[PDB]
Scaffold this motif. Structure first.
Motif, PDB file in Angstrom:
ATOM      1  N   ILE B   1       0.856  -1.230   0.000  1.00 12.17           N
ATOM      2  CA  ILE B   1       0.000   0.000   0.000  1.00 12.17           C
ATOM      3  C   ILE B   1       0.866   1.244   0.000  1.00 12.17           C
ATOM      4  O   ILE B   1       0.557   2.211  -0.698  1.00 12.17           O
ATOM      5  N   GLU B   2       1.934   1.214   0.807  1.00 10.94           N
ATOM      6  CA  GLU B   2       3.000   2.218   0.771  1.00 10.94           C
ATOM      7  C   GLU B   2       3.314   2.615  -0.671  1.00 10.94           C
ATOM      8  O   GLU B   2       3.433   3.806  -0.980  1.00 10.94           O
ATOM      9  N   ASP B   3       3.431   1.611  -1.542  1.00  5.70           N
ATOM     10  CA  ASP B   3       3.784   1.811  -2.954  1.00  5.70           C
ATOM     11  C   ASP B   3       2.753   2.603  -3.762  1.00  5.70           C
ATOM     12  O   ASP B   3       3.115   3.225  -4.762  1.00  5.70           O
ATOM     13  N   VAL B   4       1.476   2.534  -3.374  1.00  8.81           N
ATOM     14  CA  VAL B   4       0.422   3.282  -4.071  1.00  8.81           C
ATOM     15  C   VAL B   4       0.386   4.713  -3.548  1.00  8.81           C
ATOM     16  O   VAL B   4      -0.053   5.622  -4.252  1.00  8.81           O
ATOM     17  N   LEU B   5       0.831   4.889  -2.302  1.00  6.86           N
ATOM     18  CA  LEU B   5       0.991   6.199  -1.711  1.00  6.86           C
ATOM     19  C   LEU B   5       2.196   6.934  -2.301  1.00  6.86           C
ATOM     20  O   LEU B   5       2.157   8.150  -2.465  1.00  6.86           O
ATOM     21  N   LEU B   6       3.264   6.199  -2.616  1.00  2.00           N
ATOM     22  CA  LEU B   6       4.411   6.783  -3.327  1.00  2.00           C
ATOM     23  C   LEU B   6       3.979   7.232  -4.716  1.00  2.00           C
ATOM     24  O   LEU B   6       4.286   8.355  -5.148  1.00  2.00           O
ATOM     25  N   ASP B   7       3.256   6.354  -5.409  1.00  5.60           N
ATOM     26  CA  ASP B   7       2.769   6.683  -6.738  1.00  5.60           C
ATOM     27  C   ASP B   7       1.894   7.937  -6.704  1.00  5.60           C
ATOM     28  O   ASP B   7       1.901   8.740  -7.634  1.00  5.60           O
ATOM     29  N   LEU B   8       1.154   8.136  -5.630  1.00  4.71           N
ATOM     30  CA  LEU B   8       0.427   9.388  -5.516  1.00  4.71           C
ATOM     31  C   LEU B   8       1.416  10.539  -5.292  1.00  4.71           C
ATOM     32  O   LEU B   8       1.395  11.536  -6.023  1.00  4.71           O
ATOM     33  N   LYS B   9       2.302  10.368  -4.316  1.00  2.89           N
ATOM     34  CA  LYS B   9       3.290  11.382  -3.978  1.00  2.89           C
ATOM     35  C   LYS B   9       4.052  11.854  -5.226  1.00  2.89           C
ATOM     36  O   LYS B   9       3.921  13.008  -5.647  1.00  2.89           O
ATOM     37  N   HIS B  10       4.821  10.948  -5.824  1.00  6.14           N
ATOM     38  CA  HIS B  10       5.562  11.241  -7.043  1.00  6.14           C
ATOM     39  C   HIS B  10       4.679  11.894  -8.097  1.00  6.14           C
ATOM     40  O   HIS B  10       5.141  12.753  -8.832  1.00  6.14           O
ATOM     41  N   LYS B  11       3.416  11.482  -8.179  1.00  6.11           N
ATOM     42  CA  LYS B  11       2.480  12.067  -9.143  1.00  6.11           C
ATOM     43  C   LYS B  11       2.205  13.531  -8.814  1.00  6.11           C
ATOM     44  O   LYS B  11       2.313  14.395  -9.667  1.00  6.11           O
ATOM     45  N   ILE B  12       1.858  13.799  -7.565  1.00  4.63           N
ATOM     46  CA  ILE B  12       1.540  15.144  -7.145  1.00  4.63           C
ATOM     47  C   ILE B  12       2.748  16.040  -7.311  1.00  4.63           C
ATOM     48  O   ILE B  12       2.600  17.206  -7.658  1.00  4.63           O
ATOM     49  N   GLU B  13       3.946  15.496  -7.087  1.00  8.29           N
ATOM     50  CA  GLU B  13       5.182  16.286  -7.174  1.00  8.29           C
ATOM     51  C   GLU B  13       5.436  16.761  -8.604  1.00  8.29           C
ATOM     52  O   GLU B  13       6.051  17.799  -8.818  1.00  8.29           O
ATOM     53  N   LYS B  14       4.911  16.019  -9.575  1.00  9.01           N
ATOM     54  CA  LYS B  14       5.027  16.390 -10.989  1.00  9.01           C
ATOM     55  C   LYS B  14       4.193  17.625 -11.365  1.00  9.01           C
ATOM     56  O   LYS B  14       4.559  18.359 -12.277  1.00  9.01           O
ATOM     57  N   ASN B  15       3.073  17.840 -10.676  1.00  9.26           N
ATOM     58  CA  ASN B  15       2.195  18.982 -10.989  1.00  9.26           C
ATOM     59  C   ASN B  15       2.284  20.150  -9.998  1.00  9.26           C
ATOM     60  O   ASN B  15       1.794  21.237 -10.286  1.00  9.26           O
TER      61      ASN B  15
END
Ligand SMILES: [Zn+2]
Ligand SMILES: [Zn+2]
Ligand SMILES: [Zn+2]
Ligand SMILES: [Zn+2]
Lengths: 611, 605
Positions: B1-15
């Motif tokens: 689940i940590e990994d889906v939270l990273l994918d959100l994090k990294h995603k938000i950091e892009k915008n």
């Protein structure tokens, strides 16, 4: 295991009721029954009153059996008429004889004396059921697991009650406002019973009942599965229950048991060839059979600490039952009708509607529409004869889709008679897709037919009927078309060999396609009957279509109403199911209006409280 | 689940815009939460979060990374230097659900500064976001005990919010759609309300009450396959604080429930008060105790308050909105939006479609409603109740006067009428004694001014010299007077002590201010039973303070609902009440309606 201690109490009780000279070894609950083991079975074969005098003071069903074949067969064959077969079940030996009176009680007594096994003599069936024999061999090969499954089921039935609450309710999991995937949950605080678990009938074949909901999962919470009759739309997904971890009993009539295995193995076999989704493998049919416990009509059976079940004749197909559930010490009584026919037919007696008590009835509604009468037996026959006569006399051949069991058998009885009385012309009636094997099974269950057919089984042995299940044989009918009649599967043209026959005979207008019962929503057969001439496989149909809706094996609208109206006692509620939406709702409000009984159509996933 | 939270994090950091950073991304309860060491940057540009929310379809809050949060004790000191001494700060509460600090001040403008200047300087120095609030007049000891308890349990709390959060944001897994409602109590009866709303993905419990009537031990049918195992339950919603709706919520936790309880903030406070009291009184009176106080604690650790009109994802396919019910402080009408517009069902709970002394009318306007499940307490054809103005004059004229009441509900409306009457001189004068947690309940109203109507809001009556609380030495001392005492239908509590002693003199009056349910002592008396204790004591019924819609008002509520619902179902009334109201709505309004039965399940879609 503190259940051992109730079996000891039962052992000792029995032992001080037994006459001098009679002993038992062990006492076990095996499925519904209390079973006495004995090293002196002969003594129980001689005096049937012991079991009477025993069951009496114990207020329960009790069987005795011998304390634990190829030497028995040989010892029997010396000691004993023209015996066809033997089957060593319960420590019984079934003997098939052409003249059964000659083998029977002086001589049966002497046979048990010398061999121990209890002889049950039976008249030699005109037709050999390959399914009945395969099942018998399969049960022998699996005796150890079977005994163990009976012990487990048994001890669970006789667990003690633990709620200070009483209520009863029914949840619907399929079969409501639709035909197809019947599946119902009857539940109390102590118990959960599943009545039926069918496949869908209609546009989408994959569609199952809602088995994944909190009321059914976890499946180990289910005390029993009842199969009302052998039709796929009522038993077809019972093996899926096992695939998903159910490990209790399946209760049905003996003929149901045999048909269910036949139709199930065939379902998944055909599904493979035609290239559809296969819901379970053949191993799960085996597992279901190891858990099947047959019960005869009128045999009151504890299936749970607070539920007693009795099957009665439904009149629909061989072995079809009406299911009466007696809850508590007279708390409530509910009847699930399954599919039924309240009318005497060529094969069966009318559905039963007399019970000691009935507060709630859950009824089918297939012909439930205000409109939905079907012709009288005698008129349906004349109609069939004329359609088939006319088709043959003008050189066409008559394709009649049918189910393996149900519409095919009633049609065969009409045809053989008609040909015999020179009322249809002598012509071959081909039978394809397990019809014939299904018919063989009837011969093995004479008690499940009405008096007249019982004495007759002989219609089904007419020279006229020619079976075909070889594909090589099918092509010979096709490549040499020649005026004839074809009964073929499946009964609503959603697949099976009838589609091969149809793919090839639909072009000549000389031919005829005979619908002998209702065709459900979403089926190919239904689509044709509505006058669609383009049927997907894409090839155009010029062939005559006649509807002779007299062989469905269901009560028509009048009969549905008469069944409830004449029920004794009168129920306080009725619920309807197993019809298209308008059918269920029409029948329900009709019963409220005419009979003043509160009644309403069920909805999938609703739960109704009965008490 | 940590990994889906990273994918959100990294995603938000892009915008994110240049200069703006986040540290961690967590699901906490219904929200996605972004942690940041630069909160100021999110305070300046609100467009950053508001866009992300609308983009991902989900509520988003930002909060300060704990690494930039001062400890409360250093925050208190930094605030005390920065703010003028005559701001007169009463209390502080450092919410751990939101990185905000609520500051209670006698003079709140002085702490905010000229245009927010001082609030800005405080956040700069302490990180926490200050929400300033006017110091409540009455001191609620319950509110303060809860605040202290939340601080003492911050770690477990954060962890429960994480767990509940990740569960809310699990992905959907069924290709089926349906909605249905199972009833587990509160049908064809008043008492033990408890309903299950279910979908293929979700199971929501609305209410879980104690029984009201002859047998107190009676619970809802919690032992059935639709509720066990209790881990299958996504959420419990508590519509309002009355015991007959929340009282067995802690039993759920006793039996292994570990998800959230959602309710309004005042409900939260009242629920804890009434639950601790329930089990305490049950001990002293010698009845069965269904749970221990530890289970009330566990419930509070799992409670997540939501304000009215806050649209809240409680499950992958369910959004919840509370609206004013008009019944008691914090009472809610519960609107559930299922799917992307698959179905909308409202559960009214208890409600009142009329402006009263304390509250605004129940709400019956929603963006959509296909199904209504409504109470039916005064559902009988017969069951009108007198007008607010006429009820008051009647109470004044009748009014030693014993008035049974609930800690919250009937007691407070009665108190407003009495203080005014004495003040104007409608009833000359008297000490109005208040026993069994009424007073503490009233204190809680003072802490939630937003949950009152405009007129009471401006007023906060309750500080009149007349009211004298009592909770055992005081009891014994109880001369002509008035006694509001618990419980409201006379099944126990101090009102039974008062009654055991005052029932003999015919001079004395017993005032029923709201309905008495089947099987209660109050109902038996109210029917004119005189027996056992010999009961020559005046009995008057002034049924104007129940806090429920009368028969007219029930009908008006549905009749004017917008949109019009396609079905209604009735509950929370005696059998005839539920059935009468149902068929009356079918007949008059042509909306298909029917009374529910305990243990039936109805399919909505
Ligand atoms: Zn059938
Ligand atoms: Zn059927
Ligand atoms: Zn209430
Ligand atoms: Zn209530």
């Amino acid at each position: 295991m503190p259940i051992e201690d109730v079996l000891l109490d039962l052992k000792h009780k029995i032992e001080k009721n037994l006459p001098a000279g009679v002993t038992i070894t062990d006492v076990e609950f095996e499925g519904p029954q209390l079973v006495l083991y004995t090293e002196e079975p002969r003594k129980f074969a001689d005096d049937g009153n012991i079991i009477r005098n025993l069951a009496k003071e114990l207020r329960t069903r009790i069987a005795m059996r011998p304390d634990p074949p190829e030497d028995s067969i040989s010892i029997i064959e010396e000691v004993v008429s023209v015996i066809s077969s033997y089957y060593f079940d319960s420590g019984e030996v079934i003997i098939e004889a052409e003249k059964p009176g000659l083998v029977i009680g002086a001589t049966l007594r002497e046979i048990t004396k010398q061999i121990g096994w209890i002889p049950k003599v039976v008249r030699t069936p005109p037709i050999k059921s390959r399914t009945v024999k395969n099942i018998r061999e399969f049960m022998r090969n699996n005796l150890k697991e079977r005994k163990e499954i009976l012990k487990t089921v048994g001890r669970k039935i006789h667990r003690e009650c633990t709620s200070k609450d009483q209520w009863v309710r029914v949840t619907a999991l399929g079969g409501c406002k639709e035909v197809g995937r019947s599946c119902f949950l009857l539940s109390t605080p102590e118990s959960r019973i599943l009545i039926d678990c069918g496949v869908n009938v209609g546009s989408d074949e994959n569609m199952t009942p809602y088995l994944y909901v909190p009321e059914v999962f976890p499946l180990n919470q289910i005390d029993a599965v009842i199969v009302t009759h052998a039709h796929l739309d009522h038993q077809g997904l019972v093996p899926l229950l096992f695939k998903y971890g159910y490990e209790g009993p399946v209760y049905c009539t003996p003929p149901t048991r045999d048909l269910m295995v036949l139709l199930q193995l065939d379902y998944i076999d055909v599904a493979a060839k035609e290239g559809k989704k296969i819901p379970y493998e053949s191993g799960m049919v085996a597992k279901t059979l190891k858990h099947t416990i047959p019960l005869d009509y009128e045999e009151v059976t504890d299936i749970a600490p607070d539920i007693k079940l009795t099957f009665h004749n439904a009149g629909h197909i061989l072995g079809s039952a009406i299911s009466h559930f007696h809850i508590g010490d007279g708390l409530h009584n509910v009847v699930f009708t399954g599919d039924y026919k309240y009318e005497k037919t060529r094969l069966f007696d009318p559905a039963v509607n007399k019970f000691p008590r009935v507060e709630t009835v859950i009824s089918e509604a297939t012909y439930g529409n205000a409109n939905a009468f079907q012709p009288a037996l005698k008129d349906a026959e004349k109609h069939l004869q004329m359609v088939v006569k006319n088709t043959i006399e003008r050189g066409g051949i008559a394709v009649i889709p049918a189910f393996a069991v149900g519409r095919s058998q009633e049609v065969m009885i009409v045809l053989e008679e008609s040909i015999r009385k020179g009322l249809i012309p002598e012509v071959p009636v081909y039978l394809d897709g397990m019809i014939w094997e299904a018919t063989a099974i009837h011969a093995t269950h004479p008690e499940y037919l009405n008096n007249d057919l019982r004495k007759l089984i002989n219609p089904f042995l007419s020279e006229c009927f020619k079976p075909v299940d070889s594909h090589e044989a099918r092509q010979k009918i096709i490549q040499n078309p020649q005026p004839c009649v074809i009964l073929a599967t499946s009964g609503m043209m959603n697949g099976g060999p009838v589609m091969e026959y149809f793919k090839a005979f639909a072009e000549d207008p000389r031919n005829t396609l005979v619908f002998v019962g209702y065709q459900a929503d979403g089926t190919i057969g239904r689509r044709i009957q509505k006058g669609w001439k383009e049927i997907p496989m894409m090839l155009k149909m010029n062939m005559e279509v006649q509807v002779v809706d007299g062989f469905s094996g269901h009560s028509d609208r009048r009969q549905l109403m008469e069944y409830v109206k004449r029920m004794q006692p009168r129920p306080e509620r009725v619920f309807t199911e197993h019809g298209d939406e308008k059918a269920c709702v029409d029948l329900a409000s009709s019963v409220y209006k005419k009979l003043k009984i509160e009644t309403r159509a069920l909805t999938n996933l609703e739960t109704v409280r009965l008490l």
